Design a protein around this ligand. Structure first.
Ligand SMILES: CNS(=O)(=O)c1ccc(OC)c(Br)c1
Lengths: 237, 300
C-alpha cells in the first residue's frame, strides 16, 4: 500500500525501487501583461527519479517546448511525468527495472498506474512521508543542467556522491533528506552552511562538498539548527 | 396473457413477480400467478419468511415455454420447472383458474414501468450472462458473484457480465494514456459498443439487467456492473445523441422504481455525483438529474 513510518526501512532493502517526485516538472513565472493582466512564462523543469539505496538519480529534463500549444498544463505534467518514467523503466534492462515505484504525490498514482499497465508486477505506491525532494532544484549543479538545457534530456547523477563508501544507505538518505529539508526551509542559509568554508570544495564529479566524517557531523548539526531556527521564526516559538 | 402455476406453497414466502410482491402464508392455498403480460421478460423471485438470507429468483419469458414452480423440500427452495406437455399445462392451469387459487399480475393500463425497465433486456442475452443452458429460464440469487469479482469462486454459478475496467490495457490505447483515461470514448465506442456489444441496445440490456438483479436480489456485483456501465458513458466525451437520450430515460425509471429505503445500499454516491455534476455528460441527463435531485438529494 502506502509507505510511511512503520515500513521506513524497506527503502534500503535489495528490491529495486524508485521515488518519483513530480513537483518540478511544470514550473512557471507569473508576471503582469502589458494590459495589466497576468500570464505565466514556463521555465525548464525536471523529473526527480531516485534509487534511495544506490543514490542513482535519473534527472529527466523537461524543456518548455513540451508545453507549447498544450492546455491544462498542471494535469498534463502528471501524465508527462508518468510517460517519461514508463519510458525509463522500458529503457532499463529487466534486472534493473524497479519492483516498486513510490510517488511523492497521490495525484501521480493513476497517471503512473495507467502508463505502467504493461508492467503489472511493478507496484505503484504513495507515501505518507513528507519528503523534501522539491528542493532538488536548490542543488546548484542540478539547477544548472536544467536551466541550460535547450532540448529534452536525461542526466544521470549520484545524489550521495561517494558517501556510500563510508556510510550506509539508510544514513545517506537521512543526510540527503536533512540537506534538502534545510534547503527547502531556508535556501540561502543552507547554502551558506554548505559553502562557507572555501577549503572544502565540491569535486567536479560531485554535488556536495568533500566533507570529512567529522565535518559532516558539524554540517548535519548546523542543518538541524537551521531547521529548528526557521521553525521558531515561523511559528514565533 | 400467461400463467406460472405453483404446485403448492409449503413454506411461508414473500413472492416477487417483476416489481410487485405479495406474502404467501405457509401452506396457503396459493397456486400461482395469472395474467402475466406476454412480450416482456419477467422475474419471479422469493424471500423465505423464516430466513430472508438468499433472495433468489428466475428470469423467464413466457414465450419460450410453459413454466411452473414446485418447492423442493430437499434443496429447500421454490424451483422453476418447464412442463413440455402442453395439454397438461392447460388442465393444471385451468383447474386453479376455475378454483381462483391464483394472484393476477396486477398491471395498471397507464403503467409502462416494467416495459421501461426491461425495454432492452432479452432472454437470449440473460442466458449468456447466466450459464445454465439446460433451462430456458435463468436462476439468480443475492450471493452470486460476477466474473470480474472472481478475478479479484465457483465459475458455474457466476454472473458473466461484460468486464469493464478503466485501468486495463483493453481500456487504454498505447500512446493515448491520458486521453483515453480522461475521455473514455475509445473504450465505449470502439471497444465495448462496436467490439463487444455490437450495438447500444445490447449494452443497455445488460445495464438494465444488472440494475434489476441489484434491486431485486441485493446482488452486489450486479450493482457494480450497473454503476460501471453508466460511468463508462458519462465519462465518454463522445456519445451518440440517441444513446444519451435513452440512457436518461433508462436511469429515470430505475431511480423512480428504486425503493426509497434501499437507496443507501444500491446507489454509489461517487459515481452518481461524478456522472450528474462532474462528467462530460453532466448536462445531458435532464430527467435523471431531476428525479435524483428531488428524490435522493441527501446523496448529492
Ligand atoms: C411433472 N409434471 S406435472 O404434471 O407434475 C406438473 C405439476 C405441476 C404443474 O404446475 C403446478 C404442472 Br404445470 C405440471
Amino acid at each position: 500500500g502506502a509507505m510511511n513510518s512503520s515500513n521506513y526501512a524497506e527503502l534500503f532493502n535489495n528490491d529495486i525501487k524508485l521515488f518519483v517526485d513530480d513537483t518540478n516538472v511544470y514550473r512557471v513565472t507569473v508576471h503582469k501583461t502589458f494590459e495589466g493582466n497576468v500570464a505565466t512564462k514556463a521555465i525548464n523543469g525536471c523529473i526527480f527519479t531516485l534509487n534511495p539505496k544506490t543514490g542513482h538519480l535519473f534527472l529527466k529534463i523537461i524543456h518548455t517546448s513540451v508545453w507549447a500549444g498544450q492546455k491544462r498544463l498542471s494535469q498534463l505534467a502528471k501524465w508527462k511525468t508518468a510517460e517519461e518514467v514508463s519510458a525509463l523503466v522500458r529503457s532499463l534492462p529487466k534486472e534493473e527495472q524497479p519492483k516498486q515505484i513510490i510517488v511523492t504525490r497521490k495525484a501521480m498514482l493513476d497517471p503512473l498506474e495507467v502508463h505502467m499497465l504493461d508492467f503489472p508486477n511493478i507496484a505503484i505506491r504513495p507515501t505518507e512521508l513528507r519528503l523534501p525532494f522539491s528542493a532538488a532544484m536548490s542543488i546548484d549543479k542540478l539547477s544548472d543542467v536544467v536551466m541550460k538545457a535547450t532540448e529534452p534530456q536525461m542526466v544521470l547523477f549520484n545524489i550521495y556522491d561517494d558517501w556510500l563508501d563510508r556510510i550506509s544507505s539508510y544514513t545517506a538518505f537521512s543526510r540527503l533528506t536533512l540537506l534538502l529539508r534545510a534547503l527547502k526551509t531556508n535556501e540561502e542559509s543552507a547554502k551558506m552552511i554548505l559553502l562557507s568554508d572555501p577549503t572544502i570544495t565540491i569535486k567536479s564529479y560531485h554535488l556536495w562538498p568533500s566533507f570529512t566524517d567529522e565535518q559532516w557531523i558539524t554540517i548535519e548539526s548546523q542543518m538541524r539548527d537551521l531547521i529548528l531556527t526557521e521553525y521558531g521564526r515561523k511559528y514565533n516559538v | 396473457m400467461n400463467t406460472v402455476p405453483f404446485t403448492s406453497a409449503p413454506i411461508e414466502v414473500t413472492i416477487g413477480i417483476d416489481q410487485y410482491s405479495f406474502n404467501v402464508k405457509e401452506n396457503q392455498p396459493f397456486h400461482g400467478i395469472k395474467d402475466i403480460p406476454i412480450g416482456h421478460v419477467h422475474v419471479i423471485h422469493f424471500q423465505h419468511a423464516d430466513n430472508s438470507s438468499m433472495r433468489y429468483g428466475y428470469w423467464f419469458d413466457c414465450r419460450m415455454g410453459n413454466f411452473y414452480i414446485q418447492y423442493d423440500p430437499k434443496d429447500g427452495l421454490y424451483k422453476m420447472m418447464e412442463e413440455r406437455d402442453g395439454a397438461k399445462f392447460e388442465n393444471i392451469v385451468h383447474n386453479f383458474k376455475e378454483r381462483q387459487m391464483m394472484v393476477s399480475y396486477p398491471k395498471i393500463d397507464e403503467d409502462d414501468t416494467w416495459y421501461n425497465l426491461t425495454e432492452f433486456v432479452q432472454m437470449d442475452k440473460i442466458r449468456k450472462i447466466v450459464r445454465k443452458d439446460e433451462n430456458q429460464f435463468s436462476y439468480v440469487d443475492s450471493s452470486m458473484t460476477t466474473v470480474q469479482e472472481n478475478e479479484l469462486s465457483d465459475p458455474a454459478h457466476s454472473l458473466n457480465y461484460t468486464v469493464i475496467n478503466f485501468k486495463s490495457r483493453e481500456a487504454i490505447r498505447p500512446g493515448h494514456e491520458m486521453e483515453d483515461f480522461l475521455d473514455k470514448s475509445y473504450y465505449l465506442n470502439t471497444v465495448m459498443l462496436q467490439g463487444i456489444f455490437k450495438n447500444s441496445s445490447n449494452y443497455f440490456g445488460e445495464l438494465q439487467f444488472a440494475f434489476l438483479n441489484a434491486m431485486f436480489f441485493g446482488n452486489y456485483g450486479s450493482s457494480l456492473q450497473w454503476h460501471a456501465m453508466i460511468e463508462l458513458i458519462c465519462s465518454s466525451a463522445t456519445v451518440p445523441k440517441h444513446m444519451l437520450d435513452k440512457l436518461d430515460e433508462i436511469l429515470y425509471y430505475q431511480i423512480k422504481t428504486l425503493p426509497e429505503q434501499y437507496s443507501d445500499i444500491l446507489l454509489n454516491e461517487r459515481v452518481w455525483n461524478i456522472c450528474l455534476y462532474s462528467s462530460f455528460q453532466k448536462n445531458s441527463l435532464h430527467n435523471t438529474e431531476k428525479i435524483m435531485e428531488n428524490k435522493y438529494p441527501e446523496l448529492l
